[model samples]
Structures are given as C-alpha cells and as structure tokens.
Target: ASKRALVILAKGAEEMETVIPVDVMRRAGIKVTVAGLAGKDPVQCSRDVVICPDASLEDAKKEGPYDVVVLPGGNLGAQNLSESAAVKEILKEQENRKGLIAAICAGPTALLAHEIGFGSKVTTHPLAKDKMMNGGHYTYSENRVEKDGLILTSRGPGTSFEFALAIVEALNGKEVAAQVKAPLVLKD
Candidate 1:
C-alpha cells in the first residue's frame, strides 16, 4: 500500500517549506494530504501564496491512520501551529500511533511544545537550536536531515530534499529511497 502523509498548514506557512516536501514525496509515490486548521478559509502563506487545504483538521482527524504527519515552518506559521490546541492534539495522536512525525525550521518547536522531545533527537533552524537542544541531545548538522526513532527533522529551506528523502526511506525503505534520490542527482 502507498504510504500517506499529512502536511499541516496554517496561516503564514512558508510556501517552500510546505510545498517542497509535498512535491518530493508525491514524486516518490507517497500520498500526501495538505490539511489546515478547522473552519479556516484557505490561508495565505508568507509569500502571499494561497493554499487551500485538502481537508480541515476536524475532518482529516477522522481520515488518518496515516503514515506520517509533517509540519512546515515559518515565523508566524510555526507559532500558529505550535500554539493551537487542535494541532497539538493531532500531534499527540500521531505520536500515540507511532506514526512518523517530522518538522522543519521553527516547526520543531511545535514538537517541543507538545512534549514530543523528551527522548527524540531533533534538529531545527539555527535560530531555534538552543531551545531544541534543551529538549534532548541534539546534533547540529549542516546535513539536511536527522532522525530519532519515528521522528524526523530538518534544518531549513536548503534541507527539504534531504528531509523528503529521509521520509521516503523511513516509510518505504532505503532501496526505494535511493531510487527517488537518484533522479535528483542526489548522492547519498
């Protein structure tokens, strides 16, 4: 069966951060749903880009049994997602399910807020490293991706491809991930 990933979006989400992973994962044949908070109209991203969600949180919550939950970061976007009770509850559910959870940039702070960092190795945008380090033993890497258990994270914009590939590896397997990487001329 094809793996399913949920990409949560909120007002002010970074266009690149959200779209890149969606694009790459789809390229690898993983099914991805871009979900937004309950009752919100299509939100505009930081770049004035409007993204209509595949489903609202209230509805998507029922559709899951998904393979992964991905959080994309921007200044305001990360803040909105991290602070919302609905998003936190969803993260908690994904955690309980042992489903893969990933965040990029300041999005890692959302994991921290939900107490998802106790034993996980996490990475984030440089500006948030001190906070992420406080939650666990974090390795600062120029590399794009890092994983601890079912949780995966990446630094920032430059790391999207690596982050997506890491998710492919986790969900599919390294062999299939390699095939996904090969086309991008990405060297493992």
Candidate 2:
C-alpha cells in the first residue's frame, strides 16, 4: 500500500526541517500533506520563510488513517502544536494505532506533551535535550536519525537530509532508501 504522511506546520515552524522532509517524501512518491494549525494563511518558519499549507488542520485531521505524523522543530512551533487539542488528539490516535510519529529538534517537545516520549529513544537539538528528555530514554548522537519503535527523531538543520531519508526508509525499505541515498551522495 502506498503510505500517506501528514506534516503539521504551525506558525514559526523550522523551514528547512519542515520543507526538506516534505520534498523528500514527495520525491519518493509518498503522499505528503502539509497542514497548518492556525488559519489557512501562510505560516512563517523560524527562519522567516513563509510556507503555505496544503490544507488546514481541520481538513487534514479528517483525512484520517495516515501512515505517519511528522513534526518539524521550532520552539514556538512546538508550543503551538502542543496546545492544539486537535493535533494532540490526532497524535494520540496515531500512537494508539502504532503509526509512526517523527519529530526533530524541539518538535519532540510536543510529542513529550502527549506522553509519546515515554520509554522511547529520542533525539533533538542539543540545546533542547533537557526538554526532550521529558519522559523518554534520550540518546545523544551525531547520527542524523534514530528510531525507537514507531518514534523517529533527528537533531537540527544539519541532519535534515538524513532525517527525511530516515522517514523514507521507514515507510519504504532500506534498499529503496539506499538507492535514493546514492544519487544524493548520502553516506548512510
């Protein structure tokens, strides 16, 4: 079955982290849905990039049964996402169904709020380690990606490529991921 991924973008999301994964997924032929939390107006990333969502949160939430939920890290973005009842509900359901929930940098903080961090091996931007350790067994790594069960996470902008490729590997297979990585000159 073709996998579908829902990427939640709130105001102040990390542009590279958010956009890179979406682009990679689309290139890999996965259905990528970018959803905005506030209104449908373009949302701004932490670096001042304005990103237009493919749909609003309400509409995306209704497109249920997604294969994965991806959260890109930004301090403000994570805060906004965690405060949204709808986002939280969707995350809860995703967790219940054993669906993948991946986050990077401070994005993991939002997952921490949903108690999804418990017992999971997670990583985030170094500065946010204290916050990322909320309820999880955190591992500090130079590795661009780490997977513990259905939760996947990476560090910061430096790891975005690896982060996105990791998601592709999870949804597709390592062999396919390897083929994609070769053209990009990605070591692993």
Candidate 3:
C-alpha cells in the first residue's frame, strides 16, 4: 500500500518548512494532503508565500489515520496550531494509534501545547527552545533533524530539506529517499 501524509497548513506557517516536505513526499510517491487549518482557502505563509490547500482540515479530518501527520512552523503559525481544538483532537488520536508525527521549527511547540509525545526527545527552532522545554516534559536536542520513536522534529528553515528527507526515509525507505533525493543535487 502507498504511504500517506497529512500536512496541516495554518496561516503564518513557514513556507519552506511546509512546502519542502509536501514536495519531497510527493516525489517519494506518498499520497500527500495539504490541508488548510482554517478552511479550503489559500494560506498566507510567514514570508508572504501563499498556498492553496487540497482540502479544509474540517473536511480532511474525516479521512482518518494518515501514516504521518506533519506540522510546519513560524512562531505565529505554531501559536495558531497550539490554540486549535481541532488540532488537539487530531494529534491525540494520531498518538493513540502510534502514527508518525513530524514537526519543524516552531511547530513542535504545538505538540507541547497538545501534550503529545511528552516523554520523547525533540528539537525545535532555537528560539522556541524555552517554550518547548517549559516543563521539561521531553529532552531537547540541537540536531538538524531528530527522530525518536514516532515523533520527528527538526530546526528552522535551513534544515527543511533534511527534515523532509527524513520523513521520506521513514515513510518510504532509505533507498526511496535516496532516489528521491539524488535528482535534487543536495550537498549531503
């Protein structure tokens, strides 16, 4: 069966973090859905890049049990996700089912807000460190990409490709990840 991914797109999300994974996952043949958190309208990213979602999260939620749930980050984007009741329900259910949950930059702060993966190790954008570590619920790391069990995390936009590639490797396989990566001419 083909792997599937759900990337939650909220207003103010970091464009690179959001698009990189979506594009890379598609290249790896994962059925990727970019769902708008607000509705099926276009999202205005942190740097002003606009993206049209494939479906409204409200509509998307009915399509349950994605292989992975992705969160992209900008401080305000993460803040919006953290405050969402809908996102809370999704993450909680994903955790209960032991599905992969990947977040980047300020994205992991949303996990903290929802209290998902409390004991797993994680890393967020350096600026978001204090927020992610407020109660020391999880150990922190400075790696460009960090994956512990089902929870995957990465730093800022600079690490977006590595983060996306890691997700590809996890959902597909290392060979598929390498094949998808080669044509991109990545530095390594």
Candidate 4:
C-alpha cells in the first residue's frame, strides 16, 4: 500500500514550506492530499502565493488514517491553525494513532496550541521558539530537523528541503529519500 499524507493548508501558510513537502513526498511515491483548512478554495499564502487545495479538510477527514499529517508555517498561518478546533481534533487523533506529525517554521506552535506531543524534543523557527516554549511543555532543539518519536519539526524556509526529506525518510525510507534527493542537486 502507498503511504498517504494529509497536508493542512490554511490561509497565510508559507508557500515554500507547504509545496516543498508535498513535492518531495510525491517524488517518494507517497499519496499526498493538500486539504484546505477553510474550504475547497484557493488560499493566499504568507507571501501572497495563492494555492488551491485538493479538497476541503471537512471532506478529507473522512478519508483518513493517513500515515502522516503535515503543517506548514508562517506566523499567521500557525495562528489560524492554532485557533481551529478542527485542527485540534486532527492533531489529537494523529497523536493518539501514533502517526507521524511533521511541522516546520512556525507550524510547531500549532502543536503547542493543540496540546499535542508535549514531552517530545522539538524545533521551530527561531522566531517562534518563545511561543512554542511558553509553558515549557516540550524541550527545544536548534536542529534543522528534529524528530522525537512521531512528532517531527524543523526550522524555516531555508531548511524546507531537509524537512521534506526527513518526512520522506520517515514514511518511505532513507533509500527512497536519497533517490528523491539525487536529482535535486541539493547542497549539504
């Protein structure tokens, strides 16, 4: 069976953070669903990049048991995710299932908001560290990509490729990740 991924796309998300993971995961042959947090509509990203989601989250939830749930970041995007009960439920369910949950840039703050993955070592965009550490629920790391158990997190746009590859390695394998990375000519 092919590994399936659900990427929640909300308004103000970082375009690079959202697209990179979806693209890389597809390269690894994972089934990726870009679900709109709002509805089946186009979302205006952090940098004003508009993206059309594959389906509304309300609709996608019924298709679940996804291997992974991805969250992309931008301050406002994270904020929107943090405030959504839908997102809260999704994260809680993903946590309960022990599925991989990956977030990048400010996206980890949504984990904090949902009270998920609380005791894991995590990382977030440096600008978001303070918010993610508010009650010290989780230990913080400066790693470009940090995976503590099923919760995976990363820094920022600069590390988006690393973050995506890490998700690929988790869902597929190191060999698949390497195979996907080779043609990209990524620098170490």
| Global Cα lDDT for candidate 3 | 0.95
Per-residue lDDT of model 2, residues 103-186, tens digit only: 998888888777664776778888888876654455555456889899998989879998888899999989877777776766
Candidate 2 collision pairs: none
- TM-score for all models, in order of appearance: 0.90, 0.92, 0.99, 0.99
> How much is 81 displaced in model 3, in angstroms?
0.4
TM-score between candidate 2 and the true structure: 0.92
Alpha-carbon shift of residue 159 in model 3 (angstroms): 0.7
Off by over 4 Å in 3: none
User: Taking the tens digit of each residue's C-alpha lDDT, what string does model 4 give over 128-188?
Assistant: 9999999989999999999999999999999999999999999888999999999999987
Q: Which order, best to worst by lDDT? A: 4, 3, 2, 1
Q: How accurate is candidate 1 locally (lDDT)?
A: 0.83
Please list the residue runs of candidate 4 whose C-alpha ends up more than 4 Å from where it truly belongs after superposition.
none
Error of 2 at 33 (Å): 0.2
Q: What lDDT tens digits, residue by residue, belong to model 3 across residues 31-68?
A: 99999999999999999999999999998899877999
What does each candidate score in C-alpha RMSD? Answer: 2.1, 1.8, 0.6, 0.5
How many residue pairs clash in each candidate at the backbone level? 0, 0, 0, 0
RMSD of 3: 0.6
